[PDB]
Write a protein that binds this DNA or RNA. Structure first.
Lengths: 426, 338, 341, 117, 149, 342, 150
DNA sequence: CGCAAGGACCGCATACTACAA
RNA sequence: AUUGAAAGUUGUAGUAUGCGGUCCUUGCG
């Protein structure tokens, strides 16, 4: 998965996958700015591999075929500078158990050679996203609890050219499902899963593991994840992509951002838990979650549109139009923030901590929208509030008449700040 | 084997302690309540290291004698004494008495088992700034009840009839705006205390305080960590559960730290973070369960629970220890009294 | 008799995942009966030496003295006993019964308010167990899981010689933090000799408790008293319900969930018309035999709270409101109450 | 720490001086800076630094600063040092966004580039 | 944090009440906003008693005796007088009773006049009153600057 | 461990501002305090940082008198690390690692934080004397019994390291308790009237037990040389006051210097946006101490010159003695200059 | 149990100023003259000296400057409004510099029950300077309260 | 022959965890 | 006779860099 982590686009556009590919001898490199560095890394890798081959073949412990293939089978972890701290560290990273003064000099030469490369394209990224998406309880629609009235399935206006009683009956009774309709739905699902998902993922430079029906599992570079997760949510909601049908339904997502060190089992379990939590909170949402190597786990469940608000705020922050210090003050003030104060406090803070102009007003409006689009997880009747939150404008009215009406706001802002902090990282 | 006796330890902090947990680097806390805690693993590691260094330095008062660990090594190990002595010097093993008490080294851990089990240290008093008189020692009835039940374990094993009578009298109920405190913290005139920025009123029931003091007097002696008992007695306040919870949540110190690059002379990239520290003068306790030595052919004078208990009490009475990280910057010094 | 076991701090009943050098993580599960059984057996055996080897069943997989089961407990103004929530209770606290439609030739176990339902996680008060067995679940007789205990996480690191982190010396564990005045309670058959007070080390990582022997409370005696009424009601109806309070190993040679009628015949039931088993995921578990110092064979057990709906021809002849099931019964497995559905 | 040389500055007032210290409600409405414990008058180092930097920048802008018996032109000298980025620095300096090269080197960077060095 | 919520609610309430009076008149709104902003500076330099005396002095009336109650800010003639009377009323109210008997903060003065309380008390009471006044002024500055014109 | 101990005394030549964390509350940038009591303090992290920087800078100039030999970084490193030393020398050139002596004493640098710990420990600096304005006389040093209590505790801790029984007895010889307002005052501060020593805004009553004060002066002569950081100790002996705990706490909160600072526009001639702010400064002549501890040097293959706790302690004592230190922020505006007496 | 002199200064200043309003409510001229004198005294003190200002007050009260007894100066004796105001101001200042707030209070004056003029006459410079400082502070507070209320 | 500061500006921008275990 | 006995969240790291209490104003009719 370190390959996926390195698949993220660099500043120059030459992602580290190509750089490692040349070292493995599998693919060429278009850029030639640091071609001598590429030769230095290739020579260092070949010399280190040959020196290791002499020692490994001396005892003939590992099979000779592995040593022969090590020219193109060198692990991508060698490209990470920290892994090259010592000869023992490099030997372990290569895979062969450690249990060499010349190799010590070789590691120094390789480290110096890699220093120039890391000075231009940056260190190889060590973070990646796991994304699992599931259908939003297709059993309900198959049973007919989500279908509309039969009027939406006549030809154009046949209800006009029919008896009044039949028109009234078709106006109210929700249409059921016939085997032909079921086959049509299944073909639409196939069209989405086979003819659209692989291409969309390849656009995002990700990796697709298992795409069965309405279930999607992908490993992506952090640089292009939130875009893809949005785009797929659109593809699953389109009803007519040209002359090709699409499911036109809702789906629930679970996304995790993790460094390349955590165990795979724990990562998969945590991602499944995040997806289940997003499903439980009211579906039609995504449970974004960032877990660093330190241990901090910042999680928030949001609708898919709120990713755009977070993107707008992150773009405002990266462009330095607004100082990245309002976030911490707002986080401190969240626990003492109510509906009556929040708008004025936010407007004052945006005025005080920006370069004025229309940027403060735009930031305040985008923050208002983003805080509106957050799924709160209270205790008690959270089903009613969360459904309204996923509904739309009814969230403002229902929350106005809500009993708590404060804790919902306290958690909504905190959630919207959390994934803003996540996106601002990248 | 089973566990027979239960000793009581008292840790008094003199510098802020940072027993780190998994704010960016917070301190360990309980999940159900939230009081600061120090896991039994950290105490066991600290005690094991101190005991290993002491025994290797040959300063152990085993029944008022000079414990020559090398000499006693051949008594039990016999033929294998040379190999064990070499391995101990090679850090692959541990000194014999330490292995007997705490347990076998991480290499040969499948052979025998240790004879001590250290529990998590729980807080007992918390210092909080007060308007009249500095740093009132605050506590709560929930902490009192936990102490009363917990001590009942050790005292019953010790057949302490006198102490058990005082324990049953620990009954109190407090509202959120009520507190019981000594005269030092009480403002002259109006009967109120100004702990932090709250204006809690005095319930005027000081009978509880003395019984609490007496428990400390019996457990740790009258010399209260180098302080007169009267000064500590006069400045003890007990407040409701929630006020104490908020204090434990917020009164801990928060320190922001940076790293300055030699070039230029300003903060480098990625050079700011936060840390949390427990205040000094925070009374704390912990229980250690001791059993019969599971070791075979153990040397004499260490064969029963009473012998091990006496050895531990002698070695770890009125000592000084460092707990948790940040030792290089003077954090973690604590006075230990058994 | 019962043994109130108030824990000093968190405990860890480790999952069967290996503690390899690379695999240095651990997770806790709910306490299995065999762990408590082993703890009690060791506590009795060590105190009385080798003379009680037969009673402890040294070497053998089963002892001679009987352990009924283990419930949780708390001290919410009174000594309350709690058991696992049966899988047949919905989140709306509504019972679930079969509604077999013979016209279509199916045996749908749909609820009374739809054909879809999810089990209610939590615990059922032992006071309300009688009402549940009579199919009259109240509203205040259940509590959720988080009010009793919450799982916490810890990290650990083994230092090198002086002050640095030793290689391959990092681990992370997860343990059960019981709330205040909330511990475990082991139910032992009367007549077994045991000390009154003391301490006992249960579970891994060398954690101890403050165990205290107590007589049975009023709830169990009330259930025993009303068992005759329950039994005659079951005999009249012909529809007997079996509810599991501990995991069971009901499988024959080769563990399986097929409840064999042979065990049912021993209770007085002549002809079993039908069996409707609702449960959950199986429980995979294996212990650590001390005598051989080796892991025990793995066993799959029906999860606690599974419900069996049985329609029978005949009469129940048991004079006790519960029945043992499967193998390893003495350790506390296969404890099942019987009621009317 | 990093200092190697020092100079002792002597100030001789020829007109009455008044270093402001806010406004109080006492008899004197506009008092002067004093150390709290001693009560003697004093001028803090911040005011001196500000005045010196202002004078230095003013003299450098008019190209009247004579370093090694030669004027230190703001645009010309900074052209050699900043090299390619000198055009950006010159325009920014002209916009009163950053101090000239010599003032920036001596009295530290300006408000905009306070995190430079 | 209950005291923090109490302070925030009180500051919002008083700023809104100032908004109600002369809502269109930007003169009173502007003067009050500057008055709240500049108030904490005085407290640091001269202490609480001096600041209270100054507030009492700037009011243009005989002001017989001393009363945190009475002295209706609307009864003041000049707009500056009205704003200053409002500031004094709010600060004295918070220091005397806070928000009420059932509030988290009942007020350090036990309902007594802050100036008389300072005149007849000990040092520590003055210290805590000073710190509390500083905190509420810190909140009021932000809340009055944010919304008042 | 920590088999040796050195007590560091600091005297503030100029006002000192050790920056706190987040700039909250009315005062923008406050000094570091402790919520536990409220007294001023300096956390050990900053002290260790500045000491390490000064030590490394001195070592790079070969001015460190290692047993009166002027140890050379390059020569000693080559002698010790042998073959690999040259590589480390390159890392020293790139300002990545640090020279041998400072790495051994203060621990390694960030990139090499996996070999050995720091052979030293620097405690928090705690106040011992506080200047306070006085009516008669001027600028009276003040202190409180709680400070002396903490000092006795520190002495006892030192005794657990070097067995300084005589120091423990000397500290225990002092035991005073002023109740509410009475003070133990020197002869100078006493008003010409009957007692009535006036400190700042408080009027007190003198107490006739001044022998204790004399004993305190003796303790100073025992700890920090003979001259009180460059002045006649007996001269300071006339201007020392001991007051109750609450009064001392009140002094440590409402007597630090408060300063307002502005920024002036390039050509407007007045302040700019975000120009006015406030700062809190610890007064000059504040006396604060600490406790430096040294244990066993954990570095691998330590040099023969410094291979024992006594050698390291001697090196630290000689390097830091009547020296000068720059502490905290606001360096370029003449803040943070202190005199260090070991 | 400890009150700074600031508490006693405000307590004393409030006492005298309120003692004028109730006594001479109808004599608005007296109040105005007293307020003006309280406003103008500190500059005289800073320009000439405490002894000079006290002698000036005596001169406006047609009394000899060599022997004084502040305890024997009834303010009601003077007939002119300016004279009465001057008598009141002088009596307040001298009483504060003699007894302070009171013997029971934390501050009990400086002269220890002596006429302040004689105290300045027969004391070293330091005592005079400290008395001048105290007079300046109390005059500031009295001016504050007089402006606020009168 | 009395008059008795008053408003501007009220921390900005940047740094915002790293590597092992 | 209990997936059990064993293992110190520990090492390094300066809240630091930049910043003029400044502008306006007759002590006077």
């Amino acid at each position: 998965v370190s390959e996926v982590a390195m698949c993220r686009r660099t500043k120059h556009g030459i992602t580290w996958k190509e750089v490692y590919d040349y070292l493995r001898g599998l693919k060429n490199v278009d850029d030639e700015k640091l071609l001598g560095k590429l030769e230095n890394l290739k020579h260092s890798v070949q010399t280190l591999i040959n020196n290791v081959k002499s020692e490994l073949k001396s005892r003939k412990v590992y099979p000779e075929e592995f040593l022969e293939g090590l020219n193109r089978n060198f692990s991508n972890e060698i490209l990470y500078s920290e892994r090259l701290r010592d000869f023992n560290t490099l030997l372990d990273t290569l895979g062969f158990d450690a249990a060499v003064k010349n190799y010590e000099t070789m590691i120094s030469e390789l480290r110096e050679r890699l220093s120039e490369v890391y000075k231009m394209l940056g260190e190889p990224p060590k973070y990646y996203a796991i994304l699992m998406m599931d259908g939003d309880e297709m059993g309900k629609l198959l049973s007919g609890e989500k279908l509309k009235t039969a009027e939406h399935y006549l030809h154009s206006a046949i209800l006009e050219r029919v008896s009044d009683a039949l028109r009234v009956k078709a106006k109210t009774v929700r249409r059921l499902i016939t085997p032909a309709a079921h086959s049509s739905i299944s073909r639409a699902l196939k069209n989405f899963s086979v003819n659209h998902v692989p291409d969309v993922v390849r656009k995002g430079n990700g990796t697709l593991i298992y795409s069965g029906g309405d279930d999607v599992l992908v490993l992506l570079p952090v640089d292009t994840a939130f875009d893809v997760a949005t785009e797929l949510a659109m593809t699953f909601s389109t009803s007519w992509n040209g002359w090709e049908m699409l499911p036109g339904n809702k789906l629930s997502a679970g996304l995790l951002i993790v460094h390349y060190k955590h165990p795979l089992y724990d990562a998969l379990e945590k991602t499944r838990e995040l997806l289940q939590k997003a499903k439980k909170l009211g579906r039609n949402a995504i449970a974004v979650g960032l877990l660093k190597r330190s241990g901090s786990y910042y999680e928030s469940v949001v609708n898919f549109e709120t990713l755009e608000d977070a993107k707008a705020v992150a773009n405002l922050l990266v462009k330095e139009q607004v100082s990245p210090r309002i976030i911490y003050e707002l986080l401190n003030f969240a626990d003492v923030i109510s509906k009556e104060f929040l708008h004025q406090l936010v407007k004052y803070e945006a005025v005080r901590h920006s370069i004025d102009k229309n940027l403060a007003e735009e930031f305040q409006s985008v923050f208002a929208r983003g805080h509106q689009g957050v799924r709160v997880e209270l205790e008690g009747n959270d089903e009613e509030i969360n459904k309204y939150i996923s509904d739309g404008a009814n969230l403002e009215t229902f929350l106005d008449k809500y009993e708590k009406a404060v804790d919902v706001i306290r958690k909504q802002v905190r959630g919207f700040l959390n994934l803003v902090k996540i996106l601002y990282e990248s | 084997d089973m566990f027979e006796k239960a000793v009581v330890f008292g840790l008094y902090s003199i510098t802020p302690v940072h027993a780190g947990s998994g704010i960016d680097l917070p301190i360990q806390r309980e999940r159900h309540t939230g009081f600061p805690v120090i896991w039994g693993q950290s105490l066991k590691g600290v005690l094991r290291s101190r005991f290993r260094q002491l025994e290797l330095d040959e300063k152990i008062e085993v029944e008022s004698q000079k414990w020559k660990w090398k000499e006693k090594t051949k008594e039990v190990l016999k033929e294998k004494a040379d190999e064990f002595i070499k391995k101990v010097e090679e850090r692959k093993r541990d000194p014999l008495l330490t292995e007997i008490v705490f347990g076998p080294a991480t290499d040969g851990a499948s052979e025998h088992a240790g004879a001590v089990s250290v529990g998590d240290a729980k807080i007992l008093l918390f210092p909080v700034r007060s308007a009249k008189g500095v740093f009132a020692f605050v506590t709560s009835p929930i902490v009192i009840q936990r102490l009363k039940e917990d001590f009942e374990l050790v005292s019953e094993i010790e057949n302490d009839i006198e102490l058990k009578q005082i324990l049953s009298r620990f009954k109190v109920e407090l509202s959120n705006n009520e507190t019981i405190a000594g005269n030092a913290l009480i403002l002259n005139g109006e009967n109120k205390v100004i702990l932090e920025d709250i204006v809690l009123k005095v319930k005027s029931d000081s009978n509880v305080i003395e019984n609490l003091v007496e428990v400390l007097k019996t457990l740790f002696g009258d010399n209260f960590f180098g302080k007169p008992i009267e000064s500590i007695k006069e400045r003890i306040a007990i407040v409701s559960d929630d006020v104490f919870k908020s204090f434990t949540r917020f009164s801990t110190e928060i320190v922001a730290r940076v790293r300055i690059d030699a070039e230029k002379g300003t903060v480098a990239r990625g050079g700011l973070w936060y840390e949390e520290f427990l205040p000094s003068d925070t009374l704390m306790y912990s229980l250690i369960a001791v059993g019969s030595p599971k070791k075979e052919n153990l040397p004499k004078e260490v064969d029963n629970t009473q012998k091990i208990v006496n050895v531990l009490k002698v070695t770890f009475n009125n000592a000084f220890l460092q707990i948790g990280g940040d030792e290089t910057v003077g954090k973690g010094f604590v006075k230990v009294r058994a | 008799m019962i043994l109130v076991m108030k824990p000093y701090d968190s405990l860890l009943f480790r999952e069967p995942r290996p503690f390899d050098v690379n695999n240095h993580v651990a997770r806790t599960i709910l306490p299995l009966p065999q762990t408590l059984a082993g703890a009690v057996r060791s506590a009795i055996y060590v105190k009385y030496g080798s003379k009680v080897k037969d009673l402890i069943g040294f070497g053998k997989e089963e002892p001679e003295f009987e352990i009924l089961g283990h419930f949780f407990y708390r001290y919410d103004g009174k000594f309350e006993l709690l058991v696992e929530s049966p899988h047949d209770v919905t989140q709306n606290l509504g019972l679930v019964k079969p509604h077999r439609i013979d016209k279509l030739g199916i045996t749908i176990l749909m609820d009374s308010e739809g054909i879809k339902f999810r089990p209610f996680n939590g615990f059922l008060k032992f006071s309300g167990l009688i009402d549940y067995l009579q199919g009259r679940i109240a509203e205040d007789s259940v509590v959720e899981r988080q009010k009793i205990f919450k799982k916490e996480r810890r990290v650990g690191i083994a230092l090198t010689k002086a002050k640095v982190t030793k290689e391959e010396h990092f681990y992370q564990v997860e343990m059960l933090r019981f709330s205040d005045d909330c511990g475990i309670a082991v139910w032992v058959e009367d007549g077994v000799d045991f000390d009154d007070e003391g301490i006992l080390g249960v579970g891994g990582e060398r954690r101890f408790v403050k165990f205290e022997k107590r007589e049975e409370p009023e709830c169990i005696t009330n259930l025993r008293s009303k068992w005759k009424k329950i039994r005659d009601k079951i005999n009249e109806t012909g529809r007997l319900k079996i509810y599991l309070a501990t995991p069971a190993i009901l499988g024959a040679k080769g563990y399986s969930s097929k409840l064999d009628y042979d065990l049912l015949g021993d209770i007085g039931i002549e002809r079993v018309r039908s069996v409707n088993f609702i449960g959950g995921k199986p429980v995979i578990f294996s212990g650590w035999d001390f005598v051989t110092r080796k892991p025990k064979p793995t066993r799959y057990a029906v999860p606690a709270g599974s419900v069996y709906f049985v329609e029978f021809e005949g009469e129940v002849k048991l004079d006790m409101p519960y029945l043992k099931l499967g193998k390893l019964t003495k350790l506390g497995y296969g404890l099942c109450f019987m009621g009317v559905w | 720490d990093m200092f190697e040389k020092a100079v002792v500055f002597g100030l001789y007032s020829i007109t009455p001086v008044h270093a402001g210290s806010g406004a109080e409600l006492s008899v004197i409405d506009l008092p002067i800076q004093r150390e709290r414990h001693t009560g003697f008058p004093v001028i803090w180092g911040q005011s001196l630094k500000g005045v010196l930097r202002s004078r230095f920048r003013q003299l450098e802008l008019d190209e009247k600063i004579e370093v090694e018996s030669q004027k230190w032109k703001w645009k010309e000298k900074t052209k050699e040092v900043l090299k390619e980025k000198a055009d950006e620095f010159i325009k920014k300096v002209e916009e009163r966004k950053r101090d000239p090269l010599l003032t920036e080197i001596v009295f530290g960077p300006a408000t905009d580039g306070a995190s430079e060095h | 944090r209950e005291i923090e919520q109490e302070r925030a609610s009180f500051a919002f309430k008083v700023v809104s009440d100032i908004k109600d009076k002369y809502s269109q008149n930007k003169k009173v709104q502007g003067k009050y906003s500057s008055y709240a902003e500049k108030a904490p500076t005085i407290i640091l330099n001269n202490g609480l008693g001096a600041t209270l005396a100054f507030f009492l002095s700037k009011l243009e009336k005989p002001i017989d005796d001393v009363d945190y109650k009475s002295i209706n800010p609307e009864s003041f003639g000049n707009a500056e007088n009205i704003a200053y009377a409002f500031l004094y009323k709010h600060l004295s109210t918070w220091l005397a009773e806070g928000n009420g008997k059932d509030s988290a903060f009942s007020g350090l003065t036990n309902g007594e006049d802050p100036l008389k309380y300072i005149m007849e008390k000990t040092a520590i009471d003055v210290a805590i009153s000073t710190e509390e006044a500083l905190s509420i002024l810190n909140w009021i500055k932000k809340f009055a600057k944010a919304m008042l014109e």
